[model samples]
Target: EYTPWLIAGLGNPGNKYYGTRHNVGFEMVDRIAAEEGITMNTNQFKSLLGTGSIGEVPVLVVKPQSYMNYSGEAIGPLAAYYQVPLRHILLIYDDTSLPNGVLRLQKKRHNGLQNVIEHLDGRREFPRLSIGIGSPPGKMDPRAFLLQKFSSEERVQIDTALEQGVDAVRTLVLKGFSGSTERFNLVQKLEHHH
Candidate 1:
């Protein structure tokens, strides 16, 4: 029941949003592609995509060119065109609720995950990997906070998180969802204390 997996990193397009907390998804895709030797030169699917296989499993690393909230615009059509099942899609994005540098993987269900599912005609069985960016500082506007750039110390921490996310995605491909979830869905308590 498996098909080519679409691993999409959600982010807003353009130079303005680069390096913002909200664009961690885009950064993750870029890092993974670079490490995997996958060149994301293709501009189809409303995204910058690279087609490659991890072990025997075919994968597409995508950074949606659309705004973060409108990611379904690209994902919906691309999934249909590639004939990939909803279950085969994995989304990586930022989650402010979790502590910085923590990564959480949710299988087939998530809040705000519903919007993407509804776009695909209520297909709710997709995986998502959320990179924790921590909540906005007290009294800071949430939107403004997410768009802010990370501090030097935070950059070091986020780099670690990105690598972890990359490893998690590879595990999902080379291993299986169950294996990936078991291995990656944990709090990085050490990162918090550092």
Candidate 2:
């Protein structure tokens, strides 16, 4: 069986995007890289890539520089160049369908990547892992809305959500998607303030 060789995180670049709802993918990737003691110091194809292995599986992790909407321009080609199949690629991203601190994992083709990850074509085939950040309150436009930071009152919740997301990444890579999904999905409320 051919193993997966890529794990791409979708997000924008720059400090301005840090800690914002739209950069959740970046946040997750950062956590994964940190956990593995890998430095994201490589620059190619408009992304920061880190080459490493997990469970003897060679992995090329990437955070694209094309912002959110143009992620496919970089990703589709990268997968082909590396000969990594869609099934093996895991696209970790933010979703607004569920509340913060929740996640859903699915085995998918490149199709539905756009609606699922806010990038790539919905008709192409690629696996996706949607990490929820909840919906924006009121009448805020999604494009403008995702760029906003969680309020001071919501920071604790946001931090916990990111941590859960990090745990999911670790589980998915080491134990596969089914194990990660079972561990993350559901109404999970954590209390870690001490």
Candidate 3:
């Protein structure tokens, strides 16, 4: 079988989290599926799975329904079944380190990602896109900060940013990952400095 790019969006499983900051990955998967005319009509790996093409590249869009912490359960097996290479697995999730509406190409060990590597047999350094969920305004509890559905003001901003993200990913898949991809990340990082 031809190899596939596993685009797994990391998010908790449920209707309550449908529009929350923590569910950005779920949102991301939907966007790509919609844009690419891929129907996520199939459910497996405890996930909503879809297979289709983005230009000439074959893609498997996934939203792991196993919740955030154990998301790797699906990623590992799905990759195994579809023969997706580790580096070809693209993870899209939210990172509180960057400001809202910001997107960066990267990774770090978090509760969610921690279990991912564990399930992946200790493999590391793959493609990652961290869409910023921003830091808490003050001493607010971190859990509630992200779990809290959202602030309407930032909702639209993040919405627009996700749209940009859909386009950015095509470059990652179509063009070579090094030169052009880094330039896109640099453009996003510039927003952080200024």
Candidate 4:
């Protein structure tokens, strides 16, 4: 039988950053919560949180407010507090390399891809999911690149891309990463709304 999981979305806090590209992790968690009819707006574990069922398994979804680079700060305590095992955690964040509307899942430990795993491992624990927002233009500064609004063209494609993330998470919780990747990593295009 499969185990349950905690979905941790990494991003900065507040309304000022809500729609910015960096907030996709936060947005995706909202997507999952909406689909399951759960609310994550309350304060729990020093972050926004919600609890619900994904299939038959109980799930805890959170958007860490510790900001992006320092995301580990919030994740460490929450995992310990809840007694959630590292392998059962999922971390979602924006990745510049992945194309618009793409989702990636992994069980292996590596930098960037599984940064949260390493992060949690440092504290003798682990959990994660990394979502890609595609890359910004060449001339755009990396900092500015992260903060810019998506273009009208990219928005249409990217929204479709993001929904695949919901599917990936659903599968990750229902199936394991090895199974989910075999089923979803080959996805070239996706269109899902809910």
Winner by lDDT: 3
**Which run of 10 residues does model 4 get worst, by summed lDDT?**
109-118
Query: For each predicted model, how many residue pairs clash, with residues at least 3 apart or on different chains?
Result: 0, 8, 0, 5
Write candidate 3's Cα lDDT for 43-123 as tens digits. 888788989988889999999889899898888888888888888888998888878878887532356777778777888
Which residue pairs come into collision in candidate 4?
Answer: 86-126, 90-128, 91-128, 91-129, 101-161
Better of 1 and 2 by lDDT: 1
**TM-score between model 4 and native:** 0.82
Kindly report which residue stretches of model 4 are placed more than 4 angstroms away from their true locations once superposed: 1-3, 109-119, 123-128, 175-180, 189-194
| lDDT of the candidates, in the order given | 0.81, 0.69, 0.82, 0.70
Order of the predicted models by TM-score, top scorer first: 3, 1, 4, 2
State the lDDT of candidate 2 residue by residue for 43-125, as single tens digits.
87777888887766778888988777777767777777777876667887878886665666666522225633333334345
| lDDT of candidate 2 at residue 126, scale 0 to 100 | 57
Candidate 3's C-alpha runs over 4 A off are: 107-109, 137-140, 177-180, 192-194
Give lDDT for model 1. 0.81
Q: Which model is ahead, 1 or 3, in terms of lDDT?
A: 3
How close is each model in CA RMSD to the real structure?
A: 2.5, 4.0, 2.1, 4.1
* lDDT tens readout by residue for model 1, 89-140: 9988888878887888887622335556667887766888888888887776
The regions of model 1 sitting more than 4 angstroms off are: 109-114, 176-183, 187-191
Per-model TM against the reference: 0.89, 0.80, 0.91, 0.82
> What's the lDDT for candidate 3?
0.82
